[PDB]
Design a protein around this ligand. Structure first.
Ligand code: NA
Ligand code: NA
Ligand code: NA
Ligand code: NA
Ligand code: NA
Ligand code: NA
Ligand code: NA
Ligand code: NA
Lengths: 373, 373, 249, 124
């Protein structure tokens, strides 16, 4: 028999052992109230409770009111596989679907998109297998109601889950990173640069034990300086090795870009859906990269890290969502609190004028200092 | 007889006692070398030497090479009336025609314009009367040649100059303004604000003795802070009065605008042909206002001033060209030197990162300082 | 908004020279009736002209690219946009050029002959220069007195450009006669489809030259990629048809 | 046709993007004068061969045109094999853009081929 194969060729093949199912917020009366009842502040609800074996292969969500009225940073999505009492997916729902902070913007990637109206249509095509059921939970951590929650959870019921199917995991992390004691010595501008010989101060976006593969990252940086935020290298520790086997060259480099960019760009596997649009790199940037053709495999463990500026010199407000598969459904590290992951204010002309004043006083408060001395 | 009058009605009236003349860089051989011979660095030349009585009423100029190769800040135009050995017009030619620094950009006002190609076509419609001749001089203060200087000087020869005709004056000034000893306390952000009751430290754009009226100002600000540069009031001292009779409210206010604007805008009498296009008001802004319907009259003297920030608190790189008429051709103050009027570098992300570092040090270098503390 | 005085009446006529109907003609003619017209009021004149200008016998030697340039000391072959006898002043020009080459069309100087003088007293430097612009521009631009309301939007300066200049603050006065001219390329070397409307005042209402006919003033087709490919073929033949000629030889 | 082969039609000169084909750089000038980059990937639809393959394209209909053409071809085969000799640096140097001065010279040759009549428009 011919070994011919590819996406469109295989689509033409008849498939066995699959049955479509869908859980949605459809009005059970047949009327047009096709959303769930409101969520009060703090309320949690299991929106999908599936029994047996299957594979989720399409999720769509929308929420009312839209941002900024209701921030999607403050609505949590959690997923529990195989009857476990811990979630294997835990993230603020906006960041999970590639919508950072309390913002909204259209973008499309192969697994995740936020489509019209202006980033409110959330869709996910990651496949999520399960053997002993699946539960999807929504938690309202906002101070106001979720007036209407709309969704589709499309999945294939299977009499027998194939051999070697993994379990989908996703974890949101956040850190307000610590500058070096000598200060933010990026590019050696304010002081001498030093080597990062351990990666111990790197930001950690993923850390797990098991067998599997890493498949994606949504990276949300809020930079409080106009200085370039992305000199930092990605560094991966596979299966408990002491020296990281995968070491990068820069953050834009890791995201398949170059030369300190700040341009919107779209590829099915990587892109910049939101750029800072200000002096230098001051403000917010969202970058993503999916490792679909090129996952990062591990047999025993994986620790995915990235420098926050060269040798971790910069103070950055960083949040990430990491996506991966592993052999069984495992627990995640404790989530950041609502207060910990709150979006920070944009540095503005008043703040920078105060920096200029401190700088002028450090130079003897000479009446004709330009600013480049 | 009817007293009907207006611009288009009066244009239809036959005129007496005028004859067109034109001095131009036309090729005297009839060939197509319709520009003057090159100017070496430092070279001066009288480009127009008119005898007798007349009124210049249209000037056009262009120069090769164009900016930034050849800066029009470093080519001086001077005009001498009535056989005087001093100029009554003295300015870098770009700033005289509304092209600041070493830049080029299209704009149109009623008396002055810089038209296509991208601001290289310079035109002037101010009327310039003279009774005992006129001399127009060009000086190359660049380090390279003026390869080709093109011009038209259109004027009306008159057998009798009407007796109340004034003399056109224009003066370029430049200052790197001095901050207050306590620093740049704009908006009271870095420290307490204090009153300016005298205008003693105001920037001076015009000062003269005679009878006449002020008709215009080109204002070129290069602001080295993102802070708003224009809280400063215009203040005019007419006929040696101790308290200024005309006191304004702000710089954008004086330029018929409001609320710290940074948008391109065009009116025959006022506008913003070049805006800073960066964080806050950091960078370069060109603003103009012509006082055609509303001149500032004086019978003995005029001193035109403006604050450089409220109570002159800011360090600004400021240059101006002031335009006016007075009863006779008078002398001007010494011109700024080439070094004094040199364009300043743009403050950039590296400079501001150094300000941030001095500011972090002033706050005790807490490792997670955001920037708004 | 031009003011148009008259002492013994005024008549405004419309003529349809199209092959189809004018379905609807709308207008306002606002005027001031005066018991006494002030005595120094002139009369408004405007004249449309059109020429398909003739290249020099040696060809279109603009910029000395195809051959040596020669001086124009007389203005003999210049395009004429206005010629009249009387006392008055010129106040404006609408200039409509259709250039059939990508070469810059505007090296030509304006040249004015006032009151029958033998040597023109007003001589310019270039067409864009005369229109208060510089450096072979092709950008839309607007000033109350001058501008480019329609630009060629193609390679070089191939196609149509409309330029205007009004002489309101700075009219060109004359006591006996005026002849307003402009070169069509330096030393009138170029073939240009040129039309103009000249506007002026003079002491009495005078006659105009015969108008161009409908056929004479018909818009010309735009030179296109097929035409230029045919030029390339004749040029390749002139170079001996080397199989790899690029085009800049 | 070439645009046809690149899944387009009607002599296009518009930027366009598909995962398998597109125009990332278009000529932006009169007609099709200047530079165009087109690509097509045969991922779902490769061109298979058991023994050999020769991939060719006409340079204008019946190869009538002078074009400056360069290509990169990508493929798989059963073993690692050698390639033809590379063009030299000088051979693959980018050519100058034809400009208004060059075309005015073509116009002059064309006018002289038509008897150098003073009122030739250009479409005769
Ligand atoms: Na429904
Ligand atoms: Na329904
Ligand atoms: Na190490
Ligand atoms: Na690096
Ligand atoms: Na000339
Ligand atoms: Na000439
Ligand atoms: Na004020
Ligand atoms: Na000329």
């Amino acid at each position: 028999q011919s070994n011919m194969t590819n996406e469109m060729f295989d689509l033409a093949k008849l498939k066995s052992g699959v049955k479509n199912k869908r859980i949605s917020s459809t009005d059970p009366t047949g009327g047009n109230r096709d959303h769930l009842e409101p969520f009060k502040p703090g309320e949690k609800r299991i929106i999908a409770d599936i029994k047996g074996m299957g594979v989720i292969n399409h999720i769509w969500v929308t929420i009312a009111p839209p941002p900024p009225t209701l921030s999607r940073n403050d609505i949590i999505i959690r997923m529990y596989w195989d009857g476990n009492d811990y979630p294997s997916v835990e993230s603020p729902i906006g960041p999970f679907f590639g919508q950072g902070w309390d913002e909204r913007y259209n973008y499309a990637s192969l697994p995740l998109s936020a489509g019209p109206e202006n980033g409110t249509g959330l869709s996910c095509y990651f496949a999520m297998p399960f053997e002993k059921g699946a539960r999807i939970e929504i938690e309202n951590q906002s101070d106001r109601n979720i007036d209407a929650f709309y969704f589709y959870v499309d999945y294939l019921e299977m009499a027998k889950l194939p051999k070697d199917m993994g379990r989908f995991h996703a974890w949101y992390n956040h850190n307000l990173t610590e500058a070096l004691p000598e200060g933010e010595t990026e590019w050696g501008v304010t002081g001498a640069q030093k080597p990062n010989t351990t990666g111990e101060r790197n930001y950690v976006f993923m850390e797990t034990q098991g067998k599997g593969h890493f498949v994606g990252i949504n990276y949300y940086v809020h930079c409080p300086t106009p200085m370039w935020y992305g000199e930092g290298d990605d560094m991966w520790f596979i299966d408990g090795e002491k020296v990281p086997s995968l070491i990068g060259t820069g953050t834009e480099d890791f995201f398949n870009t170059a030369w300190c960019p700040k341009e919107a760009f779209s590829h099915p596997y990587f892109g910049y859906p939101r750029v800072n649009n200000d002096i230098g790199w001051l403000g917010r940037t969202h970058v993503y990269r999916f490792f679909i053709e090129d996952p990062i495999f591990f047999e025993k463990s994986l620790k995915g890290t990235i420098e926050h500026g060269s040798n971790n010199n910069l103070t950055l407000d960083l949040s990430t969502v990491a996506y991966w598969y592993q052999d069984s459904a495992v627990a995640l590290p404790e989530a950041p609190t609502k207060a910990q992951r709150a979006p920070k204010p944009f540095i503005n002309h008043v703040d920078i004028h105060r920096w200029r004043d401190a700088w002028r006083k450090s130079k003897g408060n000479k009446a004709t200092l330009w600013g480049n001395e």
